[PDB]
């Protein structure tokens, strides 16, 4: 779930 945060800040 929170794993999506990685892409949130990345892109």
């Amino acid at each position: 779930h929170a794993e999506g945060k990685f892409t949130s800040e990345f892109x």
Side-chain angles (χ1 to χ4, degrees):
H1 296 152
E3 268 54 36
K5 103 85 227 120
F6 229 61
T7 26
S8 301
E9 70 221 291
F10 265 61

PDB file of all heavy atoms in Angstrom, unseen atoms left out:
ATOM      1  N   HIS A   1       0.839  -1.225   0.000  1.00  0.00           N
ATOM      2  CA  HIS A   1       0.000   0.000   0.000  1.00  0.00           C
ATOM      3  C   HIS A   1       0.862   1.259   0.000  1.00  0.00           C
ATOM      4  O   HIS A   1       0.957   1.958  -1.009  1.00  0.00           O
ATOM      5  CB  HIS A   1      -0.899  -0.026   1.238  1.00  0.00           C
ATOM      6  CG  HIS A   1      -1.878  -1.158   1.244  1.00  0.00           C
ATOM      7  ND1 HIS A   1      -2.372  -1.721   2.402  1.00  0.00           N
ATOM      8  CD2 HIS A   1      -2.456  -1.835   0.223  1.00  0.00           C
ATOM      9  CE1 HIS A   1      -3.209  -2.695   2.093  1.00  0.00           C
ATOM     10  NE2 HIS A   1      -3.279  -2.784   0.778  1.00  0.00           N
ATOM     11  N   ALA A   2       1.490   1.540   1.138  1.00  0.00           N
ATOM     12  CA  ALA A   2       2.351   2.717   1.271  1.00  0.00           C
ATOM     13  C   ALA A   2       3.494   2.642   0.254  1.00  0.00           C
ATOM     14  O   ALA A   2       4.067   3.664  -0.124  1.00  0.00           O
ATOM     15  N   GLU A   3       3.820   1.426  -0.182  1.00  0.00           N
ATOM     16  CA  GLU A   3       4.894   1.220  -1.152  1.00  0.00           C
ATOM     17  C   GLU A   3       4.759   2.174  -2.336  1.00  0.00           C
ATOM     18  O   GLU A   3       5.753   2.552  -2.957  1.00  0.00           O
ATOM     19  CB  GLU A   3       4.889  -0.228  -1.646  1.00  0.00           C
ATOM     20  CG  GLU A   3       5.795  -1.148  -0.846  1.00  0.00           C
ATOM     21  CD  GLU A   3       5.500  -1.107   0.642  1.00  0.00           C
ATOM     22  OE1 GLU A   3       4.315  -0.970   1.008  1.00  0.00           O
ATOM     23  OE2 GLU A   3       6.456  -1.213   1.439  1.00  0.00           O
ATOM     24  N   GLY A   4       3.525   2.560  -2.643  1.00  0.00           N
ATOM     25  CA  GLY A   4       3.286   3.465  -3.751  1.00  0.00           C
ATOM     26  C   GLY A   4       3.918   4.827  -3.538  1.00  0.00           C
ATOM     27  O   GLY A   4       4.161   5.560  -4.497  1.00  0.00           O
ATOM     28  N   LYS A   5       4.184   5.170  -2.280  1.00  0.00           N
ATOM     29  CA  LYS A   5       4.790   6.456  -1.954  1.00  0.00           C
ATOM     30  C   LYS A   5       6.132   6.618  -2.667  1.00  0.00           C
ATOM     31  O   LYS A   5       6.514   7.724  -3.047  1.00  0.00           O
ATOM     32  CB  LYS A   5       4.956   6.598  -0.431  1.00  0.00           C
ATOM     33  CG  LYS A   5       6.376   6.373   0.077  1.00  0.00           C
ATOM     34  CD  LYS A   5       7.207   7.646  -0.013  1.00  0.00           C
ATOM     35  CE  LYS A   5       8.568   7.388  -0.642  1.00  0.00           C
ATOM     36  NZ  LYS A   5       8.763   8.163  -1.864  1.00  0.00           N
ATOM     37  N   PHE A   6       6.840   5.505  -2.846  1.00  0.00           N
ATOM     38  CA  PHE A   6       8.137   5.518  -3.515  1.00  0.00           C
ATOM     39  C   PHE A   6       8.034   6.189  -4.882  1.00  0.00           C
ATOM     40  O   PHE A   6       8.897   6.978  -5.267  1.00  0.00           O
ATOM     41  CB  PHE A   6       8.670   4.092  -3.670  1.00  0.00           C
ATOM     42  CG  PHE A   6      10.098   3.936  -3.226  1.00  0.00           C
ATOM     43  CD1 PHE A   6      10.461   4.190  -1.914  1.00  0.00           C
ATOM     44  CD2 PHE A   6      11.075   3.536  -4.123  1.00  0.00           C
ATOM     45  CE1 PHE A   6      11.771   4.049  -1.503  1.00  0.00           C
ATOM     46  CE2 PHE A   6      12.389   3.393  -3.718  1.00  0.00           C
ATOM     47  CZ  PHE A   6      12.738   3.649  -2.407  1.00  0.00           C
ATOM     48  N   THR A   7       6.968   5.870  -5.607  1.00  0.00           N
ATOM     49  CA  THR A   7       6.745   6.439  -6.929  1.00  0.00           C
ATOM     50  C   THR A   7       6.146   7.840  -6.832  1.00  0.00           C
ATOM     51  O   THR A   7       6.294   8.653  -7.745  1.00  0.00           O
ATOM     52  CB  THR A   7       5.811   5.549  -7.771  1.00  0.00           C
ATOM     53  OG1 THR A   7       4.953   4.787  -6.913  1.00  0.00           O
ATOM     54  CG2 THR A   7       6.616   4.609  -8.658  1.00  0.00           C
ATOM     55  N   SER A   8       5.466   8.115  -5.723  1.00  0.00           N
ATOM     56  CA  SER A   8       4.845   9.417  -5.511  1.00  0.00           C
ATOM     57  C   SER A   8       5.891  10.528  -5.504  1.00  0.00           C
ATOM     58  O   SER A   8       5.708  11.568  -6.138  1.00  0.00           O
ATOM     59  CB  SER A   8       4.066   9.425  -4.195  1.00  0.00           C
ATOM     60  OG  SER A   8       3.064   8.422  -4.188  1.00  0.00           O
ATOM     61  N   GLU A   9       6.985  10.302  -4.781  1.00  0.00           N
ATOM     62  CA  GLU A   9       8.058  11.287  -4.692  1.00  0.00           C
ATOM     63  C   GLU A   9       9.008  11.170  -5.878  1.00  0.00           C
ATOM     64  O   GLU A   9       9.548  12.169  -6.355  1.00  0.00           O
ATOM     65  CB  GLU A   9       8.830  11.121  -3.379  1.00  0.00           C
ATOM     66  CG  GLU A   9       9.676   9.859  -3.318  1.00  0.00           C
ATOM     67  CD  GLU A   9       9.613   9.178  -1.965  1.00  0.00           C
ATOM     68  OE1 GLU A   9      10.131   9.692  -0.974  1.00  0.00           O
ATOM     69  N   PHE A  10       9.210   9.945  -6.354  1.00  0.00           N
ATOM     70  CA  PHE A  10      10.096   9.704  -7.487  1.00  0.00           C
ATOM     71  C   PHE A  10       9.571  10.401  -8.738  1.00  0.00           C
ATOM     72  O   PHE A  10      10.283  11.180  -9.372  1.00  0.00           O
ATOM     73  CB  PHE A  10      10.239   8.203  -7.740  1.00  0.00           C
ATOM     74  CG  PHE A  10      11.451   7.600  -7.087  1.00  0.00           C
ATOM     75  CD1 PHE A  10      11.604   7.641  -5.710  1.00  0.00           C
ATOM     76  CD2 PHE A  10      12.435   6.993  -7.850  1.00  0.00           C
ATOM     77  CE1 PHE A  10      12.717   7.088  -5.107  1.00  0.00           C
ATOM     78  CE2 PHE A  10      13.551   6.439  -7.252  1.00  0.00           C
ATOM     79  CZ  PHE A  10      13.693   6.487  -5.879  1.00  0.00           C
ATOM     80  N   UNK A  11       8.319  10.121  -9.082  1.00  0.00           N
ATOM     81  CA  UNK A  11       7.691  10.725 -10.250  1.00  0.00           C
ATOM     82  C   UNK A  11       6.370  11.386  -9.870  1.00  0.00           C
ATOM     83  O   UNK A  11       5.450  11.471 -10.683  1.00  0.00           O
ATOM     84  CB  UNK A  11       7.457   9.671 -11.335  1.00  0.00           C
TER      85      UNK A  11
END
